[PDB]
Amino acid sequence: MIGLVGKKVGMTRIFTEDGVSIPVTVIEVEANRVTQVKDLANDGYRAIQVTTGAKKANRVTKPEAGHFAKAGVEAGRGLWEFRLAEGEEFTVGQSISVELFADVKKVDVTGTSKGKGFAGTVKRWNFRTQDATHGNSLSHRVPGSIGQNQTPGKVFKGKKMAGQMGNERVTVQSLDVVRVDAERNLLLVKGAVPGATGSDLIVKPAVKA
Amino acid sequence: AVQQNKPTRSKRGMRRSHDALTAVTSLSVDKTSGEKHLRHHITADGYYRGRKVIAK
Amino acid sequence: MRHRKSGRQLNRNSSHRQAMFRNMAGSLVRHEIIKTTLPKAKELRRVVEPLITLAKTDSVANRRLAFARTRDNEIVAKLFNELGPRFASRAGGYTRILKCGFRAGDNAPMAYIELVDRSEKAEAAAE
Amino acid sequence: KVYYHHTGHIGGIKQATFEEMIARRPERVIEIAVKGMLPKGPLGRAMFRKLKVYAGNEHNHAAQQPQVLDI
Amino acid sequence: MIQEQTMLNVADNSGARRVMCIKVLGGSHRRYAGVGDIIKITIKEAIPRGKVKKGDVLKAVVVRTKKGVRRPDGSVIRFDGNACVLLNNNSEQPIGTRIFGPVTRELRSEKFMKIISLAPEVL
Amino acid sequence: SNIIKQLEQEQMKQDVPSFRPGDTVEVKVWVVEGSKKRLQAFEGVVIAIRNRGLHSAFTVRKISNGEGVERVFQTHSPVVDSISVKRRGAVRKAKLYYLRERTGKAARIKERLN
RNA sequence: CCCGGCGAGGGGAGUGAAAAAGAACCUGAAACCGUGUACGUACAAGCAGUGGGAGCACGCUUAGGCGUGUGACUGCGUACC
RNA sequence: AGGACCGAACCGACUAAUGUUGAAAAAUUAGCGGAUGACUUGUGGCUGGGGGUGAAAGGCCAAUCAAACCGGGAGAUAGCU
RNA sequence: CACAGGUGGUCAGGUAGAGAAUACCAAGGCGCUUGAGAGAACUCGGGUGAAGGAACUAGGCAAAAUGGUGCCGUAACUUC
RNA sequence: AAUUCCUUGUCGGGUAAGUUCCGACCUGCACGAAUGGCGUAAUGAUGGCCAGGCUGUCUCCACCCGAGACUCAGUGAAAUU
RNA sequence: GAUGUCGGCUCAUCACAUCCUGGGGCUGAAGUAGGUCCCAAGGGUAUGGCUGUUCGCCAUUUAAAGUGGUACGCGAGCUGGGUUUAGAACGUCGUGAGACAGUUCGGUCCCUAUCUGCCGUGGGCGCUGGAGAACUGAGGGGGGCUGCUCCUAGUACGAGAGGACCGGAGUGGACGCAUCACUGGUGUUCGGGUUGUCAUGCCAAUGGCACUGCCCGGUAGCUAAAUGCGGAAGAGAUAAGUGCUGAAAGCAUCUAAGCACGAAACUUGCCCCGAGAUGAGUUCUCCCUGACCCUUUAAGGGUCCUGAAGGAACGUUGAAGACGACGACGUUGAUAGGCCGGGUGUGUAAGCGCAGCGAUGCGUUGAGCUAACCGGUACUAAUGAACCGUGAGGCUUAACCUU
């Protein structure tokens, strides 16, 4: 089963009857407007192409415009597609919204990664800050040696060094849905959504057992 | 640091290849005149969207 | 990085940023037209437009404030009496920055600054 | 035959089962068996680029009309 | 406590003046404590008619933190200093019969029916 | 959408008594406890501005006796029973921080008058 | 006489046997940096050399499988003191 | 009165941060001690290299000191590289 | 070297303050010449910290912290 | 012991603790009366130990400003080979 | 003609002869528990003191305090502290100079990254016309730990006390990732208070400057000391091991044929980058259907006419970031500043009236002033031209177009 492309829009410490407060993150649910709903009638391919959103989209290219023109006609924000399960999909006017979260207790959450600039040396990997004293040679902060000696004579792959994030996804996996609330369209999730505020996301129902 | 040997002159040229001065992709003229431009900035006659700039 | 921010600190400490902006704005109200760097030209726009806002109507406190941020006598006489009724009829955009080109002495990207209704201007040269 | 390699990560020698070579990329049992019979680096890449196996018994040189060969 | 060592104030009629934290309890590979943590104290002073004497090693609990304390609504009760009432070193509940200084409203449970219901101050 | 920072104003309650810094007040609350529902009070001086949308709270400092304690009671909390305004005292500051160590006759400010 | 700030530097016009003698001027290497041509560099690797060589320009190939220069590609292969 | 003191101006540099292909002849910035004295110190002068001069470090003796500088001996010598 | 180095004499205005400490300042000198921009790591300079209080390190340690005058009250040791 | 081959001696004390520090013992290193001894006030930019003031040195790190790095413009080195 | 040493941190990496969970035999093992005991690199694996220092001693955490290598990891990182210690001096020895693997006092490492690796990023080319959009998985890593008690279960078994695992479960601890509402932190782009001189002609008032002058509060952002939280059901191939059916050896036997079962490792499942996968992918969405001169012509060269879809420079600039790229987007425009409604800050704006012995306070004013965030407003600045991109785009078998 597919995901809902949300928007990160709100964070609230909300009260409950029992004198306990819950920090929560608030995702505004939009309905999926289908493009073509591609299926495995044609090739070995199986995924459903969805636009949950819109833009003024006065500067877009014709290959992007005819794509919204055959869809739900909403000058779309962009093109997201999703792998699917449990048989082929109902292909027109389908309008997947708050109902997806009606039986889902826990969600995966697939982010747009985290948009923290440079992130990079020392900070991103939470390393120690070298001594700020003792006349340490042109050095008040350093990450630490990335190899060993001539015997391997190299730096091994996968070491935590430097760089920007590259803004991939980052999935927390299996964090709780507190509630879903229809007609107001609020999905309260208990954990955080990746990125700064105002970001886009995918919140997709959990994969994991 | 230092270096091992004095390096070959093909190396010195590969090393500069991305740092070379890059093409301007042609030039601008005004949409509404035969006065020459400076692209998406204002000329010596104030010309872009009229008024006046740069009375030197 | 700089996420979910705006505006600018340019080249120095608060006192210098204040003193420079006083110099440059004090010069604006008397000369009508100036040239500076594009980040700097924006901070100038953002300094002068709130001084005009106080000045639309006479009001002794709004005259005191205008004398407090730029403590020069040439601007507070120009404000309110001359310059108050002029910009009275707009609600923001009393001035525009015109992106004039690069700086001759080095290259720092530059804008000419020019009042919204400015059409009378010296034709004398600048360096 | 567990195909020992050390691409760049994590403690241990690494491996892949004999079952991987048939369940996934099903050619691969014959491929990295004829691979080791070709010379050093570059020439052995130039020899190689003529072999194909596919997933098996779904082959796509129908139009060329292939010469059959018995071993 | 929050650093290794850390001297804090005595909060019961068991001893006198100040006492030194030797370890944090309620985990390991810890450098820092949460608010709801159980502390390990040594007594560096004591009082001749208290429950204890100098250099006896005990278990204890926080009654004030200068940083402040929280749990149910996440709102803090923030205090003027760190302070600790000693527990029994194996059989639980406080050792002292009196509290000295303020208290939290998070200690209001079956296992403290002795120590938050006292009259002397901050009831 | 338009919801960002707007959801703090939407949640914010309106049946809330008016306030100025140094206002004394009393928070009555429950103890909750193991088998019995009983109530209890705290009075003193409010040392800080409130208004935090939903997160708005009375930050009372008691500072009457003993060593200083600040208590934060959240206005929207279901276990908060009743709120009297009482006396309206002056400070000419947003905050009262200089009175932290003094507990003797510091939480008893006067009505401010004209 | 042309260009440029009154500049620096060069060219044209004109001088001489000669400026491929232009004022630091004698003819003039090599290092030195750059142009122009040929042909090369994106299934692509190590003393860059040796052996085999598609291809391509020029040489009436005297066409008699060659000469010249370059050279995809690749067997083999560890500088001098 | 004072081989006294806190302390500029005036002089030094115990320690600390920095510098270390520095601005630097350890300077800078901060803690610090001499300055009512065996202190700080301008001018003119003098002793010449295992020799001077030393409240002592085998200190300092023309941007330099457990061996100054130059001119001759001098192509020292080398059993050695 | 227009070296953040070294270097004798003379004259002596203001508020607070013990004064020629030290923030500013009257007459006066004078901008120790790259600039503007980025709100990147980081390097150097400069600023701040919950709670702790050197626990960092061979080592408190420059940032930060002491500092002035009026007055009470004043220890073990002392050649006072 | 600013002294101990063994040894980080023994015991008490400080102490979250104690190879250091301080006191007592001799089972005494090679202690021991002018490279002087016992003992002492004053004085030091003078050593170790302790708790308290205080502090981003640190636990444990976050953020701001500026010159470099970096961006744009100018000029344009060096260890090395 | 320099292969240069000790211990610790930061940062590591590789071998398993495994500290521990886990699966299994034996037992002088009833069960439990322990003694004995094999498979297993997957994962977690504590802190302060004194000493130059690993080891020590002592106080201490947890279920726990591992094994081995790495110029005996890591001075073109750190302490360079010890080790050489030149000076001094203790202790010691000799006529003496000077010494000590006895000792006490402070006191110096320098290298801007050329080739190479690593991580992050762009440029050039190619997937067969071009362009733009989603995307599959050949490939290769991330996560993988582990206490607690409830149930399971007071039951088999044992004289009696007692008495376990798998599975469901909540929850702690370590580890990993995001995050900024909560709680702190900072916030030289916001407010206020205040010392001094200098200043606004002068005062009441107010302002340049003094490290952001000093001092107290501070939005949004960012951030751990605060916040949420996975660590998985299931599958195969098995290991040690219990066998059945059965031979070598008429039988017996875990084995050899044969078949049920048997661990977190391993193939995975859960997570992520990924078609340069040249064996170059599918699928979606847009657009271009003119001509001659010449030569080696699946073609290339040259030219008139003529170039769409799209791109880039350029531009303001961002919820994206070194630069780029990515992204909003250039009057079709909320991009950014002003400006208006709203979030959230501060502490009562100059003047005036009034009271007072004046400083000063109080009514006008719950004032005024106000930053990043959110929505509006075209008020304002982004000529919005030209240009690079072209006229439907290979051979050959098979299948198709009268073929």
UniProtKB/Swiss-Prot annotation, chain A:
Methylated by PrmB. The modification N6-succinyllysine is found at residue 38. Keywords: Methylation, Ribonucleoprotein, Ribosomal protein, RNA-binding, rRNA-binding. One of two assembly initiator proteins, it binds directly near the 3'-end of the 23S rRNA, where it nucleates assembly of the 50S subunit. NCBIfam families: L3_bact. PANTHER family: 50S RIBOSOMAL PROTEIN L3, LARGE RIBOSOMAL SUBUNIT PROTEIN UL3C. Belongs to the universal ribosomal protein uL3 family. This is Large ribosomal subunit protein uL3. The gene is rplC.
UniProtKB/Swiss-Prot annotation, chain C:
Keywords: Ribonucleoprotein, Ribosomal protein. GO terms for cellular component: cytoplasm; cytosol; cytosolic large ribosomal subunit. InterPro entries: Ribosomal_bL17, Ribosomal_bL17_CS, Ribosomal_bL17_sf. The keyword Ribonucleoprotein applies. GO terms for biological process: cytoplasmic translation; ribosomal large subunit assembly. GO terms for molecular function: structural constituent of ribosome. Pfam families: Ribosomal_L17. Belongs to the bacterial ribosomal protein bL17 family. NCBIfam families: L17 (TIGR00059). Requires L15 for assembly into the 50S subunit. Part of the 50S ribosomal subunit. Contacts protein L32. This is Large ribosomal subunit protein bL17. The lineage of its organism: Bacteria, Pseudomonadati, Pseudomonadota, Gammaproteobacteria, Enterobacterales.
Swiss-Prot record, chain D:
Keywords: Ribonucleoprotein, Ribosomal protein. GO terms for biological process: cytoplasmic translation; negative regulation of translation. One of its GO terms (molecular function) is mRNA 5'-UTR binding. GO terms for cellular component: cytoplasm; cytosol; cytosolic large ribosomal subunit; ribosome. Belongs to the universal ribosomal protein uL13 family. It comes from Escherichia coli (strain K12). Part of the 50S ribosomal subunit. This protein is one of the early assembly proteins of the 50S ribosomal subunit, although it is not seen to bind rRNA by itself. It is important during the early stages of 50S assembly. This is Large ribosomal subunit protein uL13. The gene is rplM. It comes from the Bacteria.
From Swiss-Prot, chain E:
Changing residue 114 to A: Reduced RsfS binding. PROSITE patterns: RIBOSOMAL_L14. One of its GO terms (biological process) is cytoplasmic translation. InterPro entries: Ribosomal_uL14, Ribosomal_uL14_bac-type, Ribosomal_uL14_CS, Ribosomal_uL14_sf. One of its GO terms (cellular component) is cytosolic large ribosomal subunit. Gene3D superfamilies: Ribosomal protein L14. Keywords: Ribonucleoprotein, Ribosomal protein, RNA-binding, rRNA-binding. SUPFAM superfamilies: Ribosomal protein L14 (SSF50193). One of its GO terms (molecular function) is large ribosomal subunit rRNA binding. Binds to 23S rRNA. Forms part of two intersubunit bridges in the 70S ribosome. Belongs to the universal ribosomal protein uL14 family. This is Large ribosomal subunit protein uL14. It comes from Escherichia coli (strain K12).
